[PDB]
Design a binder for this molecule. Structure first.
Ligand SMILES: [Cl-]
Lengths: 82, 82
């Protein structure tokens, strides 16, 4: 990977463009057949509510899955950053 | 393709998001090794100047090449639409 680094670059870029994301802290992506399954942690504003942070995570899931068709599973969690 | 239809979808989407593009009229993409070479026609406003249309074409080239790393050659021309 090769194939995978270009997919990981697209995942990070997609995520970082979602309102309220303060960087991708962690991303692990793996092939399951031809499909990608991935697990991500994003940074968020410490003073966002838990509800808002969950909304940002959901918006990242939608953006990333929408942009990268091969992704068939994506978990997104959040940590306070900056 | 398989591989290629997903690349063509990304090309069209990238192009259509550039200011002043009125649809992708034509796209031919081919693999040269692992690289993509492509030829595209976009629609533009008939009342744009030739200079403006050339600027839109150049902006499409930049956007598409920037978004799809495997593309190593992209020609973009314009036709009046709508
Ligand atoms: Cl591919």
């Amino acid at each position: 990977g090769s194939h995978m680094e270009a997919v990981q670059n697209r995942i990070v870029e997609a995520a970082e463009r979602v309102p309220g994301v303060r960087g991708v802290i962690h991303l692990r992506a793996r092939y399951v057949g031809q499909d990608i399954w991935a697990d991500m942690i994003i940074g968020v504003d410490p003073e966002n509510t838990v509800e808002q942070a969950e909304e940002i995570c959901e918006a990242v899931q939608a953006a990333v899955c929408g942009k990268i068709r091969r992704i068939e599973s994506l978990h997104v969690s959040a940590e306070a950053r900056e």
